[PDB]
Amino acid sequence: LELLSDQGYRVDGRRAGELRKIQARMGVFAQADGSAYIEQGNTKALAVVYGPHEIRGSRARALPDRALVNCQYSSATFSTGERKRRPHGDRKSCEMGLQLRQTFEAAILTQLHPRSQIDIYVQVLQADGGTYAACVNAATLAVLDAGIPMRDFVCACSAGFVDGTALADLSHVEEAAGGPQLALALLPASGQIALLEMDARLHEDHLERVLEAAAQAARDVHTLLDRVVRQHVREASILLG
Amino acid sequence: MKETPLSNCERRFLLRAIEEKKRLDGRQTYDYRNIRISFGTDYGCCIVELGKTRVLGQVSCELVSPKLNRATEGILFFNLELSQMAAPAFEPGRQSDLLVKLNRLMERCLRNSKCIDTESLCVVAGEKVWQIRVDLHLLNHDGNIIDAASIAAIVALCHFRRPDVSVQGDEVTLYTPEERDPVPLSIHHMPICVSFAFFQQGTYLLVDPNEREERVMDGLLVIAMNKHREICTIQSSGGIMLLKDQVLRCSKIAGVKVAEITELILKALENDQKVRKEGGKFGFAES
Amino acid sequence: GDHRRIRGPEESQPPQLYAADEEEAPGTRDPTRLRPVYARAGLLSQAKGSAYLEAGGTKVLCAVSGPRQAPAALRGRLLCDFRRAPFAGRRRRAPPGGCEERELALALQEALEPAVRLGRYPRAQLEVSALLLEDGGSALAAALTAAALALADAGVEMYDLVVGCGLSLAPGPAPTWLLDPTRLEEERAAAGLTVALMPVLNQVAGLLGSGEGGLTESWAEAVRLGLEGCQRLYPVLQQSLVRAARRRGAAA
Amino acid sequence: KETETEVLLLEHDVPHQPFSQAVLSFLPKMPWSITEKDMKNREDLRHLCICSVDPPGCTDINDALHCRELENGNLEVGVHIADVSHFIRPGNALDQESARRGTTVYLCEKRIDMVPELLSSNLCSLKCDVDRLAFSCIWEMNHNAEILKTKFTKSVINSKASLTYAEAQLRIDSANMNDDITTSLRGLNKLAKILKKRRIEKGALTLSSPEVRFHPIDLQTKELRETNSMVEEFMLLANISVAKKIHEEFSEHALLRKHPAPPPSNYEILVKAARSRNLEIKTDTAKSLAESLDQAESPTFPYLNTLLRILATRCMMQAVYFCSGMDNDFHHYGLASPIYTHFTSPIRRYADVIVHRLLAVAIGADCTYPELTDKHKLADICKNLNFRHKMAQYAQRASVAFHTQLFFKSNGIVSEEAYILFVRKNAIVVLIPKYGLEGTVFFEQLIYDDEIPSLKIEDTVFHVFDKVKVKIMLDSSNLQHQKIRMSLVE
Amino acid sequence: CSLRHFACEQNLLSRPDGSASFLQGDTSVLAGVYGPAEVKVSKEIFNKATLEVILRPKIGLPGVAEKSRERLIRNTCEAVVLGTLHPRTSITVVLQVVSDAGSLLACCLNAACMALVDAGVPMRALFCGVACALDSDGTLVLDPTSKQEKEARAVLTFALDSVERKLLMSSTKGLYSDTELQQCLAAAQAASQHVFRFYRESLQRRYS
Ligand SMILES: [Mg+2]
């Protein structure tokens, strides 16, 4: 086992600056107002967005100014090789919920749907590294499929640091090694970050590198996603007339 | 109960005083409040109060069967509770979002940064290992927690001492604080968080925000650091759009701030040891 | 560790599993037989309606906390809490449960909603609380019957009573359907079944079953047999309710 | 240094931990004015001239002496020890943590104690001009030093002086005269010399050994002097008298120490050596040996007798504690005395404390207890104590070795002279007096004479007591066991 | 004295209505009160204020014993505090155990009382809490230490009143007898006199 061969290659067979082929789709479930699917390698996220609809049991939380974003996270038991139970209610899925919520409340441009729930839901079927970013991106595609206004593709990805270099879009192996991994989600058009999570020890001068690397990886993810979205829109319009 | 609403008067006044770079109590933007570190009688208790925010920290030990994946190194159990005396809204089982984010952040910061030696505290590899839990309790809520919680956990885990143990084969012998002198822990580096607050989408940034400043802010950047300039965690919350240079500058700030806080902590422990070496069950340090 | 109950040991296994013996088998008996039944309504005071039923080692209570404010939408409700006392059965289980208690609760609700008429109890939820003090055989059926008695006692309206009956299957070479069995005939069994009906209008209300095996014709014979058993049992409950009403007339 | 020290103390199991809280508790609070309630059973000698001799820079001073003239021509000599038993009463945790620490280690720089510095240098010690408790053994003698009347009394005294050996010698024979100290010191060194030569005639043997004690600009060698032999002779007399008493009174349970004489299969090397160097020796007993070593001198090797003294000390067995019941040897090779038990330094030993207790109960100034007669427990603790003294010796040796390594690192000295002691096939042991060091040198084709211990190379021959210059190169390949190495030249 | 050096401090915390740190010897409790405030229609009752106490140690989680103790304190306070003045509102008393060296309740009660005072909440009479430990030999000790509680066969926490020095609460561990109960109660009354003198000194110096 190893992470960076002296030549520059990884285990999976890709250099540091590149990533794995995302293969996506938009329109999985029709009984909803917006759905998506994404596989950013072996990972397999699945998003759903029940649109801006009425609040029931008002319970005096229907914001009158803006809309009410309610995003729920879930990591299936059979996601990891080690089976686990209680995927919801845990102290980690709820943190992921907070994160997704504060991202999309930033992006989703709620000032136009006051007193209304935008219900986002995310289920992770398979996890092999980069488990948050796949979900961010799937929920983005979902939102778009639901014609919900939103400032920009909020594209996310992860970076890491090994042997004085920066890796893009980590997997589980180098994610388990314990090295610093920095996940983020930004809005490309403006160059602004909507989220910045990070967990491990490393020096400071080695920050700009992984930071810009994650940013560029997110730009690439943006390219791929937007090509998908354009194919989808084109096909739909053609079928309309 | 419920928190009293915020008047538009205070909000506008605060935003303007920020525009003009004026805090309320009279300090600058790149300044904390006078943080006091007070100790208890029992090794492992610390009350740290920054300005009005008091937080308590206790550290306890146990011996237990470890978990199979790691049968060599021990365990560590964080928990932070928001006592109803901190503020009215802190009813039990209601303000769960804040609990969750704080606890995950603190776990991450301390555990995954490898601040202590989970290996040194092994006794019988497979049968019995230590288990160090740390309970932080929020007493008064005026502004910045994460910093207080972290300073408390650190002062504790550096001011705690285990009941010594002898071992031969499987024969394990525990002893009392009166029969031998308890042994301290093994720290490698003391991280302590640093909290920045963003105003007007990213234009202005403050340090050690009070409660009102937390109510009229849109974004929060937490940054964990050491005296050796080693990022341990950084987190953005509040749904805010920042940039690169902002985090770079905030880091160059956290450097100095953490250096100074660390100097203080070390002085506090020194003074506490001196006191107990002279008769007295307390220890006090002031910023 | 639960912080709402006393600090006990982490785990605790019973001694039986550490025993060494071939437990006694029942043997033979009259398949179309019924155990002696003691049913009385009006036991409890602080409850609007209560009932108690004993059939062999079976000992069940049921209480009805009456209407408590909470068309086809302004239609009543009844929520049922089945609960076996931790001192019933060879093994001990913490009070909470969460696996089979809820299944049998669903059963009770599905077997009671039909009989009860809830149009006359709108915007209301009837709290039915069953309690199984001792398990000695057909349990869910006793619970259905006891809840029916408690309801009819509190004076909630209905269409007819609910009579239950439990059956088992003999794993012998000539498998016969064993009626109203014991915990031994039920743990040494291949298949189990439970019927519950309203005998006047002859309509099932909720049934249930399971099997190490079986087949259509066998299950059908089981069904009709349980129906006959419930019919033969109904009069006891009738007399019990009459008796309780007479005692009420006596009190004033 | 602060790592190697702890490492050797962890390997030799020498407990280094500081004193626990429970221990400190049983100590006395330290306002300590002499309590005249415990002083009941005891006496008052504050009206006495006392001058405790003490090496350079010590703090656990325990012994004290005096020699008071008496009208009848006789004189009363008296030794005084710190009566620690009153502080250290049994059944405590103090006693347990002092037993485990069965002796006070004295490394080249520090000292691991057996009783806190408080009770070791502020209360029990016989500090100057401060009334301190004590046990006392008094004899009456004449100017030929034969005991006439003895006594073993508890008391409270007041040391008027805490001297040094050099200060002692100059106060003795610097022509100064005073009614306070110098006359006592002179009239006591006299009896010392008389007893010394008398016991030498009694057969007890004297020896020597390469002992170097570091400051560490340049190391130094311990220097002999009268005062040391004086105090030693007096303390040996005290130990022997105490032993005779506690034996006559207790013949079942006690703490004695023996020196099992060596089988003659060990002297044969020294015999063959002095034979190849035509000095005859009689190894049948201790006397024959000793009275022979004083004759083996020859002018060609003025530094010869010392080598044989070492070569002998390489043979003697281990002197060990034991109980008077479970054994019946009661014979000490070295001093030629049959019985001997340590009694002077309890601050530095625990058997001394147990002896204080036994002797005090024989005097009647103490109460018994089961763990004072139970031979089993006493034997077990005695075994522990022997184990502990052995560990201490090993540790101190390792420490001096470390300091020599460090000094050779700072100063790479090479090609210093050396004499020879042994001669073996693979290696040739060697001795350097300057640095007080004995070492080995391998040669890995030889000629190995064993009938006469010698080595023969095509060019030369190696016999004992020859000379060779050597270069000391320390190898640090394995930072564990950074080991010296000898290279030879002539 | 028969009992040990014990001090207090008022208005520590800025956010709560009234606060009090009460320590005696080495046990130190910290109390914070939220005065008449909101209460939902489920918890409230006309013509009375709902008093709710929540006590939490500094280790583990709160289980059952702490709930019993906080019921005791709740009902004691309902006994002294006036609540027919502030109906349809909630008074809340939070207790935190900074340290534990025996005589715990005897400290929590005093701290609760001082906090209620600082919050200017209408009380009918002060109250106090003492703890008396009966060893095997019957020799009692007031304001015990954990050693004295472990080495003893009975322990008795008494919550007394100030007007007529009655017995508002009693929580006992161990098994004891009648005469011992009576005599320890008298000694508790004396100790309560001393505690009340102390309260007066503290408040005199607080209003100066
Ligand atoms: Mg001396």
With helices defined by DSSP (H or I, 4 residues minimum), what is the helix count of chain A? Answer: 4
Percentage of residues in helical conformation of chain C: 25-40%
Roughly how many Å is the radius of gyration of chain C?
Answer: 19 Å
Main sheet makeup of chain A: 5 strands, mixed
CATH third-tier fold name of chain C: Ribosomal Protein S5, domain 2
Which structural class do you get from the secondary structure elements of chain C? alpha+beta
Query: How many domains of chain C, as an integer?
Result: 1
How far apart the termini of chain A lie comes to: 55 Å
Number of helices of chain C: 4
Radius of gyration of chain A: 18 Å
Q: What is the element string of chain C, with H for helices and E for strands?
A: EEEEHEHEEHEEEH
Number of domains of chain A: 1
PDB class: hydrolase
Keywords: RNA exosome, RNA degradation, ribonuclease, helicase, SF2, RNA-protein complex, translocase, nuclear, hydrolase
Entry title: Human nuclear exosome-MTR4 RNA complex - overall reconstruction
Chain A: Exosome complex component RRP41
Q: What would your notes on this structure say?
A:
Chain E: Belongs to the RNase PH family. Chain E: This is Exosome complex component RRP46. Chain E: InterPro entries: ExoRNase_PH_dom1 (IPR001247), ExoRNase_PH_dom2 (IPR015847), ExoRNase_PH_dom2_sf (IPR036345), PNPase/RNase_PH_dom_sf (IPR027408), Ribosomal_Su5_D2-typ_SF (IPR020568), RNase_PH (IPR050080). The structure is cut from a larger assembly and holds chains A (241 residues), B (287 residues), C (252 residues), D (490 residues) and E (208 residues). Chain A contains four helices and nine strands. By secondary structure, chain A is an alpha+beta fold. Chain A is globular, with a radius of gyration of 18 Å. Chain B is an alpha+beta fold and 287 residues long. Chains A and B meet through helix 1, strand 9 and helix 4 of A and helix 2, strand 14 and helix 5 of B. The structure holds magnesium ion. Magnesium ion binds next to strand 2 of chain D.
Topology record:
The structure is cut from a larger assembly and holds chains A (241 residues), B (287 residues), C (252 residues), D (490 residues) and E (208 residues).
Chain B: H1 8-19, E1 35-39, E2 45-50, E3 53-64, E4 76-82, H2 96-112, E5 122-124, E6 128-138, H3 146-158, E7 161-162, E8 165-168, E9 171-174, E10 183-184, E11 192-199, E12 204-207, H4 211-215, E13 219-225, E14 230-237, H5 244-276, E15 284-286
Parallel strand pairs in B: 4-6
Antiparallel strand pairs in B: 1-2, 1-15, 2-3, 3-6, 5-6, 7-10, 8-9, 11-12, 11-13, 13-14
Chain C: E1 37-41, E2 49-55, E3 58-65, E4 77-81, H1 101-112, E5 125-134, H2 140-154, E6 163-169, E7 177-179, H3 183-187, E8 191-198, E9 203-204, E10 208-211, H4 216-251
Parallel strand pairs in C: 4-5
Antiparallel strand pairs in C: 1-2, 2-3, 3-5, 6-7, 6-8, 8-9, 8-10
Chain D: H1 4-11, H2 21-26, E1 43-44, E2 52-53, E3 64-69, E4 75-81, H3 93-100, E5 105-106, E6 111-112, H4 117-123, E7 131-141, E8 149-158, E9 162-163, H5 165-173, H6 182-201, E10 212-213, E11 220-221, H7 226-249, E12 256-258, H8 268-276, H9 286-293, H10 305-313, E13 320-322, H11 351-363, H12 375-410, E14 414-416, E15 430-432, E16 437-439, E17 448-449, E18 454-456, E19 461-462, E20 469-472, E21 486-489
Parallel strand pairs in D: 1-8, 2-9
Antiparallel strand pairs in D: 3-4, 4-7, 5-6, 7-8, 10-11, 12-13, 14-20, 15-16, 17-18, 18-19, 20-21
The complex binds magnesium ion.
